[PDB]
Symmetry: D3
Subunit: 241 residues, 6 copies
């Protein structure tokens, strides 16, 4: 069935000034990532810390640990590093994990590492809508991975940043089934992947909980001319109402 | 250099709390928390590093690996914070996915900053593979320059593939001696590992190695996977390192 | 109750499976892979020798992502006498590629005879060969209009269905297929000891080769009627 | 004299080739590769629309080394209405693999109708895709019992048959096929200017798509009857 | 048709003593190769020279330039190096060359380099009976490559030294056609590939011109226990009569 | 080291006799016979090396590449004999397929023996790739030690992939200066190339480079494939090297 519930806005800045613009426009979650290391590339402990310091205590600070290989120990340590640096919401890009079992094994360890620091901290299992292009775990099993590993959020994003969006890799129907499945497990659902303002009603209709933006919040959109503008964030925030 | 007697620090690598207790009882100087299931320098879990630190006497050091790392400075910096916060005094980075000098220095500079920002007294180890060519890892011979230029404390070598072939099957005594001298001229300490057997100890002592790393030689059956760390074997090794 | 599927490689092996009480006679060629295709003449020879009350199954291969070729091969298997047409989802990498290929196979088969069965088969150990995730096979079968959602093993190294999938996940796969109105078939070096577990989880069809072969050896041994008689009793 | 083969992708394109005077109507699917297979229903629809005095050709694909699957696909193409059955020797790496696959396709096709033609097709640019050496295709066709030895290009980047094979080597290929009692078919972005050269060397069948398409573009353009009329005149 | 003509015996030694044993048994061609660098691995200029010095002037000294990549310039220079070092008969292993055109291009340059030094020196185009295992040029087109490049000999050998022979990769019929084809071009034919004494009558029957042996001339046969024995060479030489 | 003025030997790489005549007329010190069709340090033919030697004045040196070589010591030793016999005084080996120090030293030792056995006065150049990581070639930074241990005369760097990226896009001025100093401390000469432009000449002079290698900068259109060696461009370069 159709939905018309509020969606939380997650904005991905690369520095402190970008984050201040995201905060001023009304973003709910300030996401610390590093596109240079991939789709969900990890930033540095000092950048997470600087962004936490600047971000009001009522907003969440999010941090990616990377487009991860199947290395549970390394990724559990990296999640501790992100949590200790001030992240409340930790994203794991399920890139090098090839199946359900490898993904659940890695995620169970990240959940333990994070919840041992603070039980209130959020663990996000992120899959790639275009996983076939990088050989990543099937995006369609991400709600079951999140469910079985004890995560809080089932998420999708795009691995290759070539201008192709979430909607170029997954149908509205399959995305609706992904959202419903995550919800039936008691999980929240976050969607990203070069999301444009025109995609927001489609995402609201299918009952997405969280929407992630970078390009749509940038004045140019592209890596060269694009800088996060508060007015663009305000526009997005209004479409999420 | 060629030393007639040379004291070496003994590093033993356990996988759990009971193995760590055996390495402590045998007289190991450094207790190295690793996970062979994830590779040569595979990372263990934050809770395991903490449990081993808790059981290790305060006069001894706890070492931990962050993995056979890809070129991901952000991820590895975060992992180094995780290892340091969990109780490691000595943080080891396996330079596996890094392909050249520049990638290795860039990654290591960030790990050094991440670790020193927690505690300036914590040690950062840049580890290369003696058999790097077999896995496409950065040339082992440039590891002293990487450690020097990234601000690390230790230049190290180990083997990537655990097929029974040792450090000495990949590097000559002469080249290993030049590696030790080069590390020392940069004000760095030198650690050597790679299926090191008790017979290798006099050779490593001669070349001036500061730290010797073992797992297999300290394991009951001899096998580093099938067998478990035995205090008696650690004791025999500790005597040879004196 | 569970249906027993036995996989022979020739006419004498098919006769041995029939005599033992196998419900479905599956024509495959292990030389071409896990679900390797046999020849049109072999499918016809086996159909001819199989009693009319029993079903003849045939694999089209461990298929690449080539909808046209596989649709033509499915026509070839159906025309040769196959009742059940099995597709090994090997070269297909995701949900969309698998649904696209399967939709075309379903159309090709149903255009010949609407009563013929289409089986979407995934690999329990897909990660070892880079095949489509086995856990999405019930959704693929549902969306392509197939009749059976199936799992088997891609690499025949002695590792079984149970070495790659937990009883819990296998039970969820069966329930999911059933909720879509599909039948469920399970294989992958299945031994006699696995039969009560597969029965418990509600599997409709169990597929065997090795367990039906004399020296246990699927690659050096041959189908024996006594072994097929024992598996049939265990299936009841 | 040279026989003109035109490759349409649908019923309207086939009608355009027929109206222009094409001798052989070749059903292929460029989306699946150079000799990608179309669907059983498309081969049937094209056969239905083609006058009985003209031949219908169909590709089974840029095939992997899977004799069973390709034999079944060859049955599917033959049953669907194909008179000429074309096999793209892509995944086969040597003489032995190619002969083994082709022998099985020949048996599958001749078992349906002894009058149906089997075409062993190699790639003039095989080195680019790691396919079997094109120069041994006449011996493969001879030893597998095929009727036609053929060449085409695997990668459709604008490079032609003549960019990969010399006139001299192509003439030797034609002579070799003829000495084995085989017919020879040549394709690979063939343009109208290539027709006198192919005629000189003694080629029996010339295969076109691009030259028959409006914007020259095979991937954006469609078969035009006027272009097929011009190629037919040049073939006389 | 069947044949019963004399076949020339080519023996492959690794050092000067092995070559002295080959000479004493009656070998016709003393082949200088280096199995450490592959099937037709190249030995060193000094080893070729040492073997030439020891070999009577009426016997030919043969030398391989390697299991070659598609590098015409390097291989032409290496053929000059082998010819200048005392080789009269130069073998090129067509390993990295992928088709007819690459093979003819490389071979034409080797022929020019060698014939410019001495027109009487022999150029051998060698293909691999098991080429599919290494991705080498199709062995069946080697007579046409040799013909079009102006070589003197069309040859086959095995690329992988796992105990599988020439007869495990090519049928007697296809090998007979290869010999007949080379002969119809005015070329000589050389065959090798773990050739055992039992294979010699089959090779004589099909009219092979030259037979190459290493293992069959060694007392053990295997790399560890195998050293060329003059009695073994004498036995082979008698089967070649 | 940092030199205020430093004379550099100018090496120009022609592909045929007419290009060689243009490089001679422009004042090139070394005439380098290469074949870009076979790679960065692709080998030309024995007859081309001979034809170029014949046309080159006796006071100038003729250089020739043996290729972007695989690890095949026998083949490369034979190729080095071929280049030397054909008229090259200066033999360049591209360390491409060699993966480590040991493979590189083993290959180079054999090339040195093959060349010196013909003429002890002939020069052996061990060439590494500044961008080795892009092709999986041996680490460029160990090339001075390879040249030292194999008994070569020159330690050299060039670029493997000709995509417009230069020596300076892969190696810092500082690391290049250390490479030159290291080569000099071993008694070796240093040659540097890799899409070197006229603007790079003062930098290479400053770091103490002995030989500078060019093709593109001496080519009429600027393009090293599309264009041809022009005497005027060689003359402008020769003046900057003075």
């Amino acid at each position: 069935h159709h939905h018309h519930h509020h969606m939380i806005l997650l904005v991905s800045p690369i520095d402190v000034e970008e984050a201040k613009e995201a905060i001023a426009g009304g973003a709910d979650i300030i996401d610390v990532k590093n596109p240079k290391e991939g789709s969900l590339g990890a930033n540095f402990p000092w950048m997470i810390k600087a962004i936490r310091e600047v971000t009001p205590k009522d907003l969440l600070v999010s941090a990616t640990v990377g487009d991860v290989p199947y290395k549970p120990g390394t990724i559990s340590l990296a999640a501790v590093g992100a949590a200790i640096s001030g992240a409340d919401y930790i994203k794991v890009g399920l890139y090098g994990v090839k199946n359900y079992y490898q993904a659940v094994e890695l995620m169970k360890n990240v959940v333990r590492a994070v919840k041992d620091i603070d039980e209130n901290k959020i663990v996000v299992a992120a899959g790639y809508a275009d996983a076939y292009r990088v050989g990543a775990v099937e995006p369609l099993i991400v709600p079951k991975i999140a469910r079985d590993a004890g995560c809080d959020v089932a998420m999708l994003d795009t691995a290759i940043k070539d201008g192709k969006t979430l909607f170029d890799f997954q149908s509205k129907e399959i995305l609706a089934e992904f959202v419903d499945e995550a919800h039936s497990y008691g999980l929240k659902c976050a969607l990203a992947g070069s999301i444009k303002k025109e995609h927001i009603p489609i995402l609201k209709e299918i009952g997405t909980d969280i929407v992630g933006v970078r390009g749509a919040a940038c004045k140019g959109g592209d890596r060269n001319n694009g800088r996060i503008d508060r007015e663009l964030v305000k526009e997005l925030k209004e479409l999420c109402k």
